[PDB]
Symmetry: D6
Subunit: 166 residues, 12 copies
């Protein structure tokens, strides 16, 4: 039970890392090339796209993945240099859990659960309101939901382990 949780967490971490590394970059290759808007004003596309996607999904996910692994690096380097251990273990576990929960909440509040095909853009220099068409909405939505589920499972396992330790 308690020992299994660590194995499950490690396997899930490896699985999510592999998924993000393999099927992450190529899906978002043509995000801006295929983004088009129904207007003739030069420079409307850039402003509308920037308003639509302030920070791409892949950037946020890669940053989260790199950030959640800092405690392991700190522990490994401390152990290597050594050659309050319980205090360090507790502190690192608590910090990892807090960071993961915060990142999950931020992700939920940033992107939501859908990527609508049509967007309304009304920023300078675009005149009045214009309509812009997104590329690949369905695949992006599926990937969003999948990543959210994986993160939720990770958070649940971490909370269970923390509760068990007490």
């Amino acid at each position: 039970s308690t020992m299994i949780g660590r194995i499950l967490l490690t396997v899930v971490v490896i699985f999510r890392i592999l998924i993000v590394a393999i099927v992450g970059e190529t899906v978002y290759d043509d995000e801006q090339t295929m983004f088009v808007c129904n207007t003739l004003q030069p420079g409307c596309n850039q402003a509308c796209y920037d308003r639509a996607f302030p920070i791409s999904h892949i950037r946020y996910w890669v940053f989260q993945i790199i950030m959640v692994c800092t405690p392991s690096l700190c522990f490994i380097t401390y152990s290597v240099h050594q050659s309050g251990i319980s205090r360090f273990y507790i502190i690192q576990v608590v910090f990892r859990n807090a960071l993961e929960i915060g990142f999950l909440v931020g992700q939920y509040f940033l992107y939501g659960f859908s990527v609508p095909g049509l967007y309304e853009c009304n920023r300078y220099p675009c005149i009045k309101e214009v309509e812009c068409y997104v590329s690949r909405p369905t695949e992006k939505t599926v990937f969003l939901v999948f990543m959210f589920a994986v993160s939720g499972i990770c958070v649940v396992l971490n909370l269970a382990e923390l509760n068990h330790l007490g």
Copy 2:
């Protein structure tokens, strides 16, 4: 007989992995660049293509390959950390077989056995119905049939081994 089946399964797994890794990406490089439709309405191409191919073949196959290999990773990590084995072996074999059968059925119900050259698209903003032309139908069809045959052979071997174990 029984011992040979494991070797055949491993060889087939390696072969399919190599095929997907080598002749998987470059075939689907220009899926959206060369997809064209007979209309002048801006944004019709994106919607029609999204309706035509919700999730590309390569993403589904890569996800299936990664998912079917999780039990091996779990077994290896558990064995490494160790330094009910029969129960774990039976459970992971059963889970792998069930996952493979489910994925095969899902693949059959998603794509079928053909990739027609011409498609009819009647989604917003395209007015009424329009005709769109796919790129590389024959090669995609051949690859679909080949992958289906490989998956069927794998399922048959797994079922035979499970029946033998009893």
Copy 3:
């Protein structure tokens, strides 16, 4: 005499693999981008190209290379797991020879020995018959002839070894 044949076969296999891996991919990089036809009908290019080159040369050659190496993998994995050997050796050699001969015959019946520069395309939606111009005919022809010669030499060596063993 007999002992030299194995070394010659291994060297030839390595040489052909290196050639296919090094000068294979980039020669066929712009097969579809530079393929043009003399018409204005949208979608004629896709259908005409698909009719011209059902399965590209590189896919066929890579598949053949991967397929002809399965017996070695099977033998190696069986030997590793072990720690009728003569029967297994004979069976694997015979199967390899049969597969190679079949693949050579299929290649000869598929592509032939030339790649003409001009092609006549009369498939829907192209109206009546149209003329399409291929890219890089001479280099493709030279590569075809070279690969055919290499495969013929391999087949000759395998047949000689099989006859010697009897």
Copy 4:
């Protein structure tokens, strides 16, 4: 207290290097392709872009990262060749700190803290003043602020260690 500082510095260095190497290159892939200006004069784009971004962010950051690691290489090679050590250690630490502070000040005086979307270009051959639209302002601004914060933390840690040693 003081001992943990070295571990924190090493972890931060690894983290910043990983971030720059992973999420740095592809963000600035289309800096010039998507840079457009509202004019018809040929060659205005080149001059205006060159005036807008004399030296891109990524080149500066890579150069800084490479430069701040020379003292470690010098120390390692000197130690290897050997097989006033304290004086050498003090000199290398002081030089590293001075270089880092100088680079941080230069970065602050070069780019600032914002990347405006609109720019006014009045260089030859562009007639009078023209307006040019930048691509991806928000993500670049976020990256700038993040790198500045990381560099500030590194400088603070180095100054604290130097004060502790004295």
Copy 5:
């Protein structure tokens, strides 16, 4: 004297291999994209370019490099499998020398010593004679001369060694 020649030959071989691998591909990346002709007939570009460069320089040089190294592979594999040596040594030296001389003569008779900027193309479907403009003539000429000099030095050293052995 005699012993130095082997070291010189090995160093020259490594140097030429590195040069071809590093500054070989990127120079010839845009050979066909930037090749333009002064006409409006569709398909003239393909035929004229194919007539201009039947086989690119890089393909010929890579093939020569791979072909001249087969004797070393044969010797190494024979020695490995062993665990008439003089006869094999003499035979492989003679074969290498003959192959190198033949390849050098073929290169001289194929391309010559220059790459003219302007070319005259009079092949179907181009009407009458047309003029086409090559890309990067000077750099290609310099590379041709450099490779010819390197090959000449290699041939001279091989001939000297063969004469010394007698």
Copy 6:
């Protein structure tokens, strides 16, 4: 004093190699794509660009880097094969210094110290004289000056070591 010089030289060599390998290709990716001229004559761009940049900077720098390292390879291979040493050491040092000085002088006489934005092209087929606009002048100028300074420092160190040895 004298001993530190070797460490400084090795560190500088590694630093310059890393700089050229990392920030070398990216800057010169679009040298010809973004080079434009103010005319309508087909083929003027190719001739004008070829006249502007006979041999790009990166090719020259890579060739120099590879050439200056041949003596080390020769020494290492000779030492390995062995298992007048002073004469060989002196000879290879002298040759390295001479080659470096010659390459530096050639670089100075080829490119100079600036890359002007505007160029005047008067070669066939361009009629009379035309004006062409370069891409990224400032960054190229900075890189030129930086490489010149690094080469000067290397030459100074080599001359100092040679004088010390006498």
Copy 7:
């Protein structure tokens, strides 16, 4: 009363002739130039326009005007050549009235009372059904109604005169 009818008829005839001659030609100058359809198939515009407007309004109105004036020419030429008069007068009046009524009925059954802006075209070679946009619908509708009213008034006056004569 009876005498006034002839004056009113003549004035109305002159008025309609002047209107058709002055504001007729230039209103329909750009009927085909500004007619556009939402498709890329070549030749769809011609077929769709031909289906939309088999015979333009101006042709029909000019033909009617010329045809209704033949009896006057016949009467004038007969009178001139002369140098049953009542029978000729009655016959030509009856024929004029019948022709006018027939032409009015034909006009009503041909065009109706409106010119919709949007039209649906499904004729070869247009694929499936396409939408085409007409130019100047409102002005054409107003002109149609005005001409219909004028023709109705003329018919009423002619019928009244015929009834009065008895």
Copy 8:
């Protein structure tokens, strides 16, 4: 006084007719060719222009000019055929005055006194609201005001004559 009014009216009528005939057509020659809108939707131009200018100025003015001259034609033809005169004179004058007043009021309520340069168009198929730019606003405004003044003077003179007659 009373006799002068008729001369003034005739002179003004001739002057306005000459103005409309000479500077009427060519001013409005390119009304639709130079009308442009800021959008990419096909067919938006036609609908937006039709909404902007239902009936052009020239058509209305020509129709008014032709309509106000019918009484003179009726009087002339009646006099010619003759070879209650006061009643006919009074009736024709009253009808002419009433028609002129009605046409002036209609003109005022239709077009107003200005022709703005920018218009907002929100009709199908144009998506949402778009902005369209008119051609030659100032000249059209001046012509409108001039014609209104001429019509007002004519109405004033006619009213004065009618009052004088009593």
Copy 9:
């Protein structure tokens, strides 16, 4: 009867002349501008159109109209100069009738009774067979039939008069 025929002939001649002069030119204004073909070969349009319409309808009809009126001019000038009359009258009438019959037969054998929308063109430089789309088929067909009927009526009247004279 005998006298009325001349009046009918004169009226019909005037009517046909007016029709040809009024609704003849502007119908055929854009015969070549709107003629399009489905190909990319330059110059195919000119050859295909020339093959489709050797001599336009309007030229033939104008020439026929001018030719059929020469006898009247000859008679008038002879009468004027005078200041065998029956022989001259008979000769001119017979010649006019013969010319009209010949022209009618030629017209029937040239154009026929229809103007198909689609045409097949296989003349140099057009490659193989191509399809071209005509403009305004229905209106041209109606005009053809109308002119044929008018010419037939004229021929019938002339034959009747000739038979009556005997």
Copy 10:
């Protein structure tokens, strides 16, 4: 002397009318078609041209010509209707002279004596200031000067006659 002035004035009036009617329209045929501006903003051309040429020269000159001839029409119609003469003559002469002087002053204050080739346009929607190029400056300038001289001569003659009458 006094009597000759009338003949000179009439001849000059006829000459100017002929010049304006013959060489006036064709020069100003392409005023707006060939007017171009150095920008990409849609609708900038219309606003800039409208600001450059509020009322074209030809409209002003035609209006002046028509206006200066009203007194002659009034006198002729009054004389015709008649079948204080000195008072009418004096009034008409004074009014004609005043109108001509006012029109000349207005022309001088409107256009001046030159038509510069380059213009600076800074009206909405044109961003900032843009430069626009006029068509045919020299011919327009010559015509302006010629018309000004003719008008000056007419004014001088009219003033001389008025002074003579006293």
Copy 11:
């Protein structure tokens, strides 16, 4: 016999004048707009067309028609002013005949009897030889032959009259 000749000549002159005036301009309206050549060099069209058609047919025919009628104008004006007659008549007839014969010979030597569709143009700036396609060859050829026949008939009649007079 002789008397009829004058009538025939006058009728033929009127007929040819009418033909040239009616069906002369519209045929040659788009001579240069539809003239196209197979090249990309700017300015080749102008030079090639100028070489193809130095002086168009219509200009030559109009000039000939005007020139051949000068003697009649001279005779008429001399007779009018009067209010050696035989000598003047003979001189004018002889001069007219000589001019007509000279013009016919010049026409034959200029254009010939055909207008080939394809032309070869090899004038500056066109490089080498290019092929250009003419518009409307058949109709132009027919018109040429018709005009030649008419001129021949006129010359024959004039020669017959001159011989008769002697």
Copy 12:
């Protein structure tokens, strides 16, 4: 002799007027549309064309024709108003001769005797010098020479008459 000269002058005047009226406009219809230059700078065409042809030939010739006929109008109007004659006759003859000579000299000094096909334009905004290609050089040259010859003949006849009068 003397009497004939007047008739010759009148006939020549009528002939030149007819030539200028008939073959004057059609030749110069596309002077600016077909004028092209070899550059991409916007607005270069306008400036270069304006420099090439400050005042077109047709404007100058029409102005000369109108100016040379003023004396006849003055004489006719004076004679009509009449209902020193020798003095007026002599004065107007002398003025006509002087004006004609001055206009001929001006024409010779303006245009010369040729219209070259290539022109060099070096005016703002065109950068450096550019080459521009004229349209229809040969026909314009022929027309120039013809008009010069006609004017010379007129001048010779006028001088002869003036000398005869004495």
